[PDB]
């Protein structure tokens, strides 16, 4: 699983604490503040096709990082929405072709009216512990994607979007 981010980040296999850098994409949904799009930046595939299948399941413990400590939201992991932090484990994402398809969105539940947070570059934005599972054998991995931020855009903490 040696894929890349759209900006060109080198993602190594089995590096545990992963320093992978993505781009922020803020928007607004009803009751949701779209912090970041990992789908439109992380396009992946399988490194050794026709014999293995990349299943990714989000392992427990994961919240936001950096300055955000008591802040929680929602994850869109392959269409349907789930809470974030992890009370459970989301369903899998199938990877079976050599095609750079989108991989997931993070949303924030509004506490203020229209307020926001400033994010610096090199600050942590995801503490995501993942799990890569094959199909031939019932095994499991342990990667800690310490996802940081590249661009600095104002992610809203309120019920609307200010731009």
């Amino acid at each position, epitope marked *: 699983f040696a894929c890349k981010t759209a900006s060109g980040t080198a993602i190594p296999i089995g590096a545990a604490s992963a320093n992978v850098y993505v781009n922020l994409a803020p928007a607004v949904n009803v009751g949701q503040n779209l912090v970041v799009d990992l789908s439109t930046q992380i396009f992946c595939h399988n490194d050794y096709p026709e014999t293995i299948t990349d299943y990714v399941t989000l392992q*427990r413990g994961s919240a936001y990082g950096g300055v955000l400590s008591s802040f*929680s939201g929602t994850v869109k992991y392959s269409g349907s929405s789930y809470p974030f932090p992890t009370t459970s484990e989301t369903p899998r994402v199938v990877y079976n072709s050599r095609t750079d398809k989108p991989w997931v969105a993070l949303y924030l539940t509004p506490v203020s009216s229209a307020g926001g947070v400033a994010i610096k570059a090199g600050s942590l934005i995801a503490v995501l512990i993942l799990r890569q599972t094959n199909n031939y054998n019932s095994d499991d991995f342990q990667f800690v994607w310490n996802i940081y931020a590249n661009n600095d855009v104002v992610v809203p903490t309120g019920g609307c979007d200010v731009s």
Partner: antibody
Amino acid sequence: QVQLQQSGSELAKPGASVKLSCKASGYTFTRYWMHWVKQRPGQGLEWIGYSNPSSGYTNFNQKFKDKAALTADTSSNTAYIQLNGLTFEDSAVYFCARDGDPPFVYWGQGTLVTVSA
Amino acid sequence: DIQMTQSPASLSASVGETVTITCRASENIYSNLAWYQQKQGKSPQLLVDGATNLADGVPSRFSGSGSGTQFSLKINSVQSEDFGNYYCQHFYGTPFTFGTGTKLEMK
């Protein structure tokens, strides 16, 4: 102290539509999710689904996909579930609980709904 | 969408003795199991978190163990005030369904 309590026994008729109660106080209602339980006497505990107060989105079960419509009132801090088209095997007691923090176990005595012809 | 079997249906428990409750799953569930303690006519409560971590408030007589597919619960020196039902519930993938249940009675 975080606790839940619920409505009384409602007896009704099949084919009707009714929305139930799960009353709460003393905790932040919209920043942590809630889950639902159905108790069948002689069978056991079964899982219903979970809904968001803020976004309004709900993940259902396959059985409760068209059975229930799960909302959660942010202002009144009351967890809601409505059911239309009652059947003879739906006479049961519902339980409501919390989702979020590691523990996330806060429980109530349940809403008992029974229907007969 | 997975079916899960808790074993057994019922067993007899005395005072000053050890009981074992076995929770078996088909797929390798990734340690997202919880043990729920139900009373009669009363609101149920938890015992442990993740079948490895004790919840805060109850003493250490209750003990969960196991990971993967085999999940077990050892209870020693059980007393009269905790007679009820045990529900081992899995949390891997929607739906997060409960178990069948385990019934406890006076010996």
